[PDB]
Design an enzyme around this catalytic site. Structure first.
Site, PDB file in Angstrom:
ATOM      1  N   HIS A  77       0.800  -1.233   0.000  1.00  0.00           N
ATOM      2  CA  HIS A  77       0.000   0.000   0.000  1.00  0.00           C
ATOM      3  C   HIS A  77       0.838   1.292   0.000  1.00  0.00           C
ATOM      4  O   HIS A  77       0.339   2.313  -0.471  1.00  0.00           O
ATOM      5  CB  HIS A  77      -0.911  -0.055   1.271  1.00  0.00           C
ATOM      6  CG  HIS A  77      -2.064  -0.987   1.058  1.00  0.00           C
ATOM      7  ND1 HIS A  77      -3.287  -0.854   1.704  1.00  0.00           N
ATOM      8  CD2 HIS A  77      -2.167  -2.107   0.312  1.00  0.00           C
ATOM      9  CE1 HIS A  77      -4.104  -1.818   1.273  1.00  0.00           C
ATOM     10  NE2 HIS A  77      -3.449  -2.586   0.447  1.00  0.00           N
ATOM     11  N   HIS A 244      -0.673 -12.354  -3.029  1.00  0.00           N
ATOM     12  CA  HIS A 244      -1.657 -13.303  -2.433  1.00  0.00           C
ATOM     13  C   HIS A 244      -1.134 -14.712  -2.295  1.00  0.00           C
ATOM     14  O   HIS A 244      -1.935 -15.592  -1.934  1.00  0.00           O
ATOM     15  CB  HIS A 244      -3.020 -13.170  -3.095  1.00  0.00           C
ATOM     16  CG  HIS A 244      -3.639 -11.816  -2.914  1.00  0.00           C
ATOM     17  ND1 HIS A 244      -4.746 -11.375  -3.606  1.00  0.00           N
ATOM     18  CD2 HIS A 244      -3.211 -10.758  -2.173  1.00  0.00           C
ATOM     19  CE1 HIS A 244      -5.034 -10.124  -3.224  1.00  0.00           C
ATOM     20  NE2 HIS A 244      -4.108  -9.754  -2.364  1.00  0.00           N
TER      21      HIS A 244
HETATM   22  C1  HEM Z   1      -6.354  -6.103  -7.535  1.00  0.00           C
HETATM   23  C2  HEM Z   1      -5.450  -5.778  -6.642  1.00  0.00           C
HETATM   24  C3  HEM Z   1      -5.540  -6.148  -5.221  1.00  0.00           C
HETATM   25  C4  HEM Z   1      -6.662  -6.236  -4.407  1.00  0.00           C
HETATM   26  C5  HEM Z   1      -8.128  -5.926  -4.695  1.00  0.00           C
HETATM   27  C6  HEM Z   1      -6.208  -6.709  -3.094  1.00  0.00           C
HETATM   28  C7  HEM Z   1      -7.084  -6.843  -2.006  1.00  0.00           C
HETATM   29  C8  HEM Z   1      -6.677  -7.173  -0.711  1.00  0.00           C
HETATM   30  C9  HEM Z   1      -7.564  -7.255   0.403  1.00  0.00           C
HETATM   31  C10 HEM Z   1      -9.040  -6.957   0.449  1.00  0.00           C
HETATM   32  C11 HEM Z   1      -6.779  -7.793   1.414  1.00  0.00           C
HETATM   33  C12 HEM Z   1      -7.325  -7.987   2.835  1.00  0.00           C
HETATM   34  C13 HEM Z   1      -6.963  -6.851   3.787  1.00  0.00           C
HETATM   35  C14 HEM Z   1      -7.305  -7.399   5.223  1.00  0.00           C
HETATM   36  O1  HEM Z   1      -8.571  -7.646   5.421  1.00  0.00           O
HETATM   37  O2  HEM Z   1      -6.465  -7.669   6.121  1.00  0.00           O
HETATM   38  C15 HEM Z   1      -5.460  -7.904   0.951  1.00  0.00           C
HETATM   39  C16 HEM Z   1      -4.401  -8.541   1.568  1.00  0.00           C
HETATM   40  C17 HEM Z   1      -3.143  -8.670   1.117  1.00  0.00           C
HETATM   41  N1  HEM Z   1      -2.745  -8.310  -0.019  1.00  0.00           N
HETATM   42 FE1  HEM Z   1      -3.802  -7.725  -1.588  1.00  0.00          FE
HETATM   43  N2  HEM Z   1      -4.961  -6.953  -3.108  1.00  0.00           N
HETATM   44  C18 HEM Z   1      -4.472  -6.528  -4.362  1.00  0.00           C
HETATM   45  C19 HEM Z   1      -3.098  -6.568  -4.752  1.00  0.00           C
HETATM   46  C20 HEM Z   1      -1.989  -6.830  -3.868  1.00  0.00           C
HETATM   47  C21 HEM Z   1      -0.617  -6.695  -4.343  1.00  0.00           C
HETATM   48  C22 HEM Z   1      -0.242  -6.095  -5.659  1.00  0.00           C
HETATM   49  C23 HEM Z   1       0.118  -7.152  -3.247  1.00  0.00           C
HETATM   50  C24 HEM Z   1       1.567  -7.265  -3.125  1.00  0.00           C
HETATM   51  C25 HEM Z   1       2.353  -7.524  -4.144  1.00  0.00           C
HETATM   52  C26 HEM Z   1      -0.802  -7.602  -2.225  1.00  0.00           C
HETATM   53  C27 HEM Z   1      -0.526  -8.220  -1.056  1.00  0.00           C
HETATM   54  C28 HEM Z   1      -1.366  -8.510  -0.049  1.00  0.00           C
HETATM   55  C29 HEM Z   1      -0.974  -9.258   1.147  1.00  0.00           C
HETATM   56  C30 HEM Z   1       0.381  -9.915   1.408  1.00  0.00           C
HETATM   57  C31 HEM Z   1      -2.136  -9.366   1.890  1.00  0.00           C
HETATM   58  C32 HEM Z   1      -2.307 -10.099   3.226  1.00  0.00           C
HETATM   59  C33 HEM Z   1      -2.265  -9.253   4.448  1.00  0.00           C
HETATM   60  C34 HEM Z   1      -2.079  -9.967   5.755  1.00  0.00           C
HETATM   61  O3  HEM Z   1      -1.648 -11.177   5.740  1.00  0.00           O
HETATM   62  O4  HEM Z   1      -2.321  -9.348   6.869  1.00  0.00           O
HETATM   63  N3  HEM Z   1      -2.146  -7.458  -2.730  1.00  0.00           N
HETATM   64  N4  HEM Z   1      -5.480  -7.658  -0.490  1.00  0.00           N
END
Ligand code: HEM
Ligand code: HEM
Ligand SMILES: [Cl-]
Ligand SMILES: [Cl-]
Ligand code: NA
Ligand code: NA
EC number: 1.11.1.21
Lengths: 713, 713
Positions: A77, A244
């Protein structure tokens, strides 16, 4: 307390130009972050970060015993606010810790992540900025989990107040499209310069467009917003699937349990927010987005299980415990671990936006190749992660420390190394005289060097005269650059360059980038001489010339000036008044209001206007460097009226006789209208000001010529 | 474009502390306006001004052929925004030319007056500020018209953007009382710090209170607002009657003819406003206030005719051509000249507020005395005009040029001249050692010097440690100053001073003002030694001791700190949150946000709190100069909750044990909450910062000690 913005909500706002003063900076005048960082023990910082990953704090317990997913999310972010349209956002200033980003709904619980880092920030102090530390932490998370990153550069100095960015006009967090302040119009066309689908989101809505869980239509939003963050389809798939691979989302109960964002929270919250009334409010009970998805069987280890699961199962729609739309593989065994209870397992789940990577046809081809070739996935992700997190760092000369990748990437707008001796002061004098002897005019020389240098923007530190990209596609054909006039200037300068370089000894040569700048210096010097003043404009050699093959033409398009008040240029008709566009451009050029004022009044009389327009050329000695602009703009003997033909062009007529004296635009006349700008114009239009005007002009001219010169920093 | 103020309208605003940066100032870092002015040929300027008076311009023709009236009004309005409650407003920064004052309804057509002065400003450039020139022009108008002024001082440096002043909460210009944002409550009690009866007025409504034409009730408003501007009854009658000896009001047709104020006008208006559609829109047809009154038979010459007319006629209520309430002389002949037609004459007329001078009993006695003794009137008006126009200029040491009056006036808070040799470095070392040997503690020494120096305010440059007024009434009895503790410190210091001075040769002596500050320095030095640091605190001698007869106790009252976050002190309960009061005090002290931060965290550990409160004393080594405040405030091991008994006091408890570690107020904990302040606190609370903290503390301490030291400037 009622303020000027309340009484006159449409008056021009100059405070953007005086952000980041020495008043708000705690560090001394002479603090040099690069010097501090260069002595950091980066290895020691990384060891502390590694240990942090598995050291759970009870006030925000680590999922699976490991904070790595949280921190990757944090770093993504931090970088993910970036927009190519203006270069604003991105990780490079650590703005996630200030309003409004620290309180965007998509940044929920990242306040916890930042707080986890305070002990390390504290230990290393000024030798590692917050901006650097957020990115470094994400890299160490990756590395700790088995992922080989592509490298890391330090050098993001901290900032001390919010940047002024236009994030949209909606007055409600997350407002769905089509409202009174909609960022969409036409067939789902997002307004520039925005790069997110709803106010407070990073890119897209994880449930689908305006909450509609259609993976195909969500893919259209992903593609559009990622493109606006400078990522193509391959980079986009790699980034989403890569991220993810790790961690989980948080949606253990209804969203109404979550309280005020940090900027709204009570003082006792000590800068944290989203306090939750749901059960323990944390850990197994956490609520962040309201989704409850865990992508892989090993959320704390790099794998290729994201695509194994995406392709290996058939998906069905379901709702999280907060009621959000998400997807489950009902045919699957319970193979996904629980974050806290070792006796629970769960079925695979996916977001609507994850399924986009399989159900959009173009994404599916890429996802399939990554699925069948996970070493290709891992390289694409490493490269895209480095690009994501360094996209706004500027020229490679800014990169610090021992993990900078040696590979030069096309996106970095790379500048070739200089392998020869540089011209000295006597050589620069000889070249200035040769340029002036060629017949090139003050106007030609000033306009060309302005066109070359003024593509710089401090938001992402792209652009500037280094590289001589003015001679290449696409800059050579931009309308603002007057392509046929420019071509004739560059032919003459190239002939001068060839002759000089052919006559030299022992490897000495001048680049065309340096000569374009030096020739503008000569134009300014000649203009001053025209006015009866001998001055020397400072010049620093060492720019190099980039090739067309080292120039991404499609990436360069966002640097095209479609409004440049300093050349009285407006490519078409905008909703935004031209004086607003001027201040925006001044902000991108890193100019204060005084510097904008001096620079514009001098460019008008040097003949910098596109098309040789007379608008604002308030002088009878064009191509002489004088304060005529200000003296004549401020003369109460002239009365100003909008023309019948165009309400944005004005005639200045002698008040007593009616005789036509001048024409001007809104950009010109704002300096006689706005109460702060007019106070500045008065300084430069006073009888004692000829020396000041010339000195301040030369200083701001030199500042613009050197904006991209981080080799000299 | 949605901004942080939109999302979080109640978050604290720090931008006030970073106004007036070098970014917005067109002059170079080293420009010294006093030096520029000292070289101006003031006599040449005054000749130009005298010529201007009867050089009528067709775009705003001079009434009676002479602009003097317009210019006295202009100068009276420049000075007339002043409020004693905070010192803000007044003529000393030339803020009339910026928003919102340039567009206040009561400043209508003063944009014309200021534009008339552009050619003079332009001619002399930086050597005469706009601020000085507005006042000078009023003096010259008076002189031109036969009135001998008391004198003039230059030295008001120009400013380059609007000051942040609370002018009220109304959202409608001129709103009558009792609205949702009423500035009145109770028995017509005007809210502090306001000094005007309606938003956009200078003092009162010329038709009467809320538009009711009762001269008696108007008198009550005049007395209250003028006392809020530091004028008593004698000075008030002298100023109103003096001013209305000259010129006229403008109300030739309906106010609906008058167009947008300057900040709302079109760009072609070039900084002017109130364009009128009534007949020619100017001159004989002018509309400014909507009143049409001409007071005297010779409006361009000093006379005694104001009081002759006031007492010589009975008055009848009537309406101007714009419909405003005003008064006309019963039975009078047409004796008053017309401003433009020599064939017309008019009956004497008066405002409701003029009649106040006769129908309020206390004013009537003064007005009668001035009527019967016109030389008394002339001297009182001269003295009052000087006070009006210099009230916010600070110590006499700031006054520049050849017309500064030699007479020292009680209102100037005068400081006696130093007539003896000053203590040198050896003497300062000897006195510091005597102070530390006396038994006085760090807490006593720091608290006393803080109390003495922190009365300074930069709005009007009153206050500060020069004078040793802390020993006099009323400062010795202020609750914030801890009168009993203070008396014991002063007794000890006065004994040290007497012994030192008795032992000297050749006229050398130390003032108590210097010793108070020197003793505070010693305390800070001792505190550093307590913490294991070798520090020397700068000290500049040369303060003198003022007498009680040089110290107007009623005027000193407004300087009393009823909120001082630096001492964690709040005299009572205010609507305004304590952290907002802190930022306000920091702005009066001329501090930036970093300086406020470092200074408060140091004061807390040195024992400066009133009452020896433990609130915010986050250290186990009180009276040692360390950065303990910041390290402990930012420790995530501690959890903060508001107390049951008082929601504005907080307990900090060990998060794991529940044990009580600290207590704090809102002032304390805002540094851990507000995202910009917490970023500052993190710099000072880092492991590398103990030295920086000490050095930055000593710098800001010394800055505060020297705020009033214009003898050194
Ligand atoms: C279409 C693009 C993306 C969408 C809509 C998206 C959406 C989200 C959402 C809704 C969560 C949950 C937040 C929470 O409830 O804790 C999240 C988690 C996460 N996202 Fe994404 N994401 C996107 C792209 C990315 C990218 C580009 C990365 C990194 C390269 C990333 C890495 C992460 C990680 C590692 C988590 C897990 C957080 C945790 O374990 O506490 N995401 N994403
Ligand atoms: C109760 C306090 C006061 C009230 C209500 C008041 C009200 C006004 C108003 C309504 C006008 C007419 C503006 C116009 O239509 O052009 C005016 C004019 C003027 N006032 Fe006052 N006034 C006050 C005090 C002062 C003071 C203290 C001075 C100066 C010492 C002053 C000097 C003048 C002068 C010289 C004019 C004439 C302007 C001209 O000739 O254009 N007044 N006053
Ligand atoms: Cl930004
Ligand atoms: Cl002010
Ligand atoms: Na940026
Ligand atoms: Na003031």
């Amino acid at each position: 307390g009622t303020s000027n913005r309340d009484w006159w909500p449409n008056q021009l706002d100059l405070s953007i130009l005086h952000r980041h003063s020495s008043l708000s900076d705690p560090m001394g005048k002479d603090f040099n972050y690069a010097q501090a960082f260069e002595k950091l023990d980066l290895a020691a910082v990384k060891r502390d970060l590694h240990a942090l990953m598995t050291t759970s704090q009870d006030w925000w317990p680590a999922d699976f015993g490991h904070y790595g997913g949280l921190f990757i999310r944090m770093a993504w972010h931090s970088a993910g606010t970036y927009r190519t349209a203006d270069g604003r956002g991105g990780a490079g200033e650590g703005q996630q810790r200030f309003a409004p980003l620290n309180s965007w709904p998509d940044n929920a619980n990242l306040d916890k992540a930042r707080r986890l880092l305070w002990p390390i920030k504290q230990k290393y102090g000024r030798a590692i900025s917050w901006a650097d530390l957020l990115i470094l932490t994400g890299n160490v998370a990756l590395e700790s989990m088995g992922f080989k990153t592509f490298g890391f550069a330090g050098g993001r100095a901290d900032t001390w107040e919010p940047e002024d960015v236009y994030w949209g006009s909606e007055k409600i967090w997350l407002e769905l499209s089509g409202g009174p302040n909609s960022r969409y119009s036409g067939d789902r066309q997002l307004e520039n310069p925005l790069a997110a689908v709803q106010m407070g989101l990073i890119y897209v809505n994880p449930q689908g467009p305006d909450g509609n869980p259609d993976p195909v239509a969500a893919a259209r939003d992903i593609r559009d917003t990622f493109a606006r963050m400078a990522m193509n389809d391959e980079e986009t798939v790699a980034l989403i699937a890569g991220g993810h691979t790790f961690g989980k989302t948080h949606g253990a109960g209804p969203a109404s349990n979550v309280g005020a964002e940090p900027e709204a929270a009570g003082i006792e919250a000590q800068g944290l927010g989203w306090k939750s009334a749901y059960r323990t409010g944390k850990g197994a009970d956490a609520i962040t987005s309201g989704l409850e998805v865990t992508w892989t069987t090993t959320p704390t280890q790099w794998s290729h299980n994201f695509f194994e699961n995406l392709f290996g199962y058939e998906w069905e729609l379901t709702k999280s415990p907060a009621g959000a739309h998400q997807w489950v593989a009902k045919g699957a065994d319970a193979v996904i671990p629980d974050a806290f209870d070792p006796s629970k397992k769960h079925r695979p789940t996916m977001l609507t936006t994850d399924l986009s990577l399989r159900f959009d046809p173009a994404y599916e081809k890429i996802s399939r190749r990554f699925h069948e070739n996970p070493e290709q996935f891992a390289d694409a992700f490493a490269r895209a992660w480095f690009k994501l997190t360094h996209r706004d760092m500027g020229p490679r000369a800014r990169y610090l420390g021992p993990e900078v990748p040696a590979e030069v990437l096309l996106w970095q707008d790379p500048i070739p190394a200089v392998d020869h001796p540089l011209i000295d002061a006597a050589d620069a004098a000889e070249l200035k005289a040769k340029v002036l002897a060629s017949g090139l005019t003050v106007s030609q020389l000033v306009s060309t060097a302005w066109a070359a240098a003024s593509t710089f923007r401090g938001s992402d530190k792209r652009g500037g005269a280094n590289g001589a990209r003015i001679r290449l596609a696409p800059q050579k054909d931009w309308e603002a650059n007057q392509p046929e006039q420019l071509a004739a200037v560059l032919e003459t300068l190239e002939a001068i360059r060839t002759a000089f370089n052919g006559a030299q000894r022992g490897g000495k040569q001048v680049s065309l980038a340096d000569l374009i700048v030096l020739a503008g210096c000569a134009g300014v010097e000649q203009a001053a001489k025209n006015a009866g003043h001998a001055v020397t404009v400072p010049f620093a050699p060492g720019r190099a010339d980039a090739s067309q093959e080292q120039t991404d033409v499609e990436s360069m398009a966002v640097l095209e000036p479609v409004a440049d008040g300093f050349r009285n240029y407006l490519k078409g008709k905008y909703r935004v008044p031209a004086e607003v566009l001027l201040v925006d451009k001044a902000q991108l050029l890193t100019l204060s209001a005084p510097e904008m004022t001096v620079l514009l009044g001098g460019l008008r009389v040097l003949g910098a206007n596109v098309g040789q327009s007379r608008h604002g050329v308030f002088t009878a000695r064009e191509q002489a460097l004088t304060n005529d602009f200000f003296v004549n703009l401020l003369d109460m003997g002239t009365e100003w009226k909008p023309t019948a033909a165009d309400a944005d062009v004005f005639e200045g007529r002698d008040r007593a006789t009616g005789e036509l004296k001048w024409t001007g635009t809104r950009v010109d006349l704002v300096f006689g209208s706005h109460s702060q700008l007019r106070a500045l114009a008065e300084v430069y239009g006073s009888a004692d000001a000829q020396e000041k005007f010339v000195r301040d002009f030369v200083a701001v001219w030199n500042k613009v010529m050197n904006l991209d010169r981080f080799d000299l920093a």
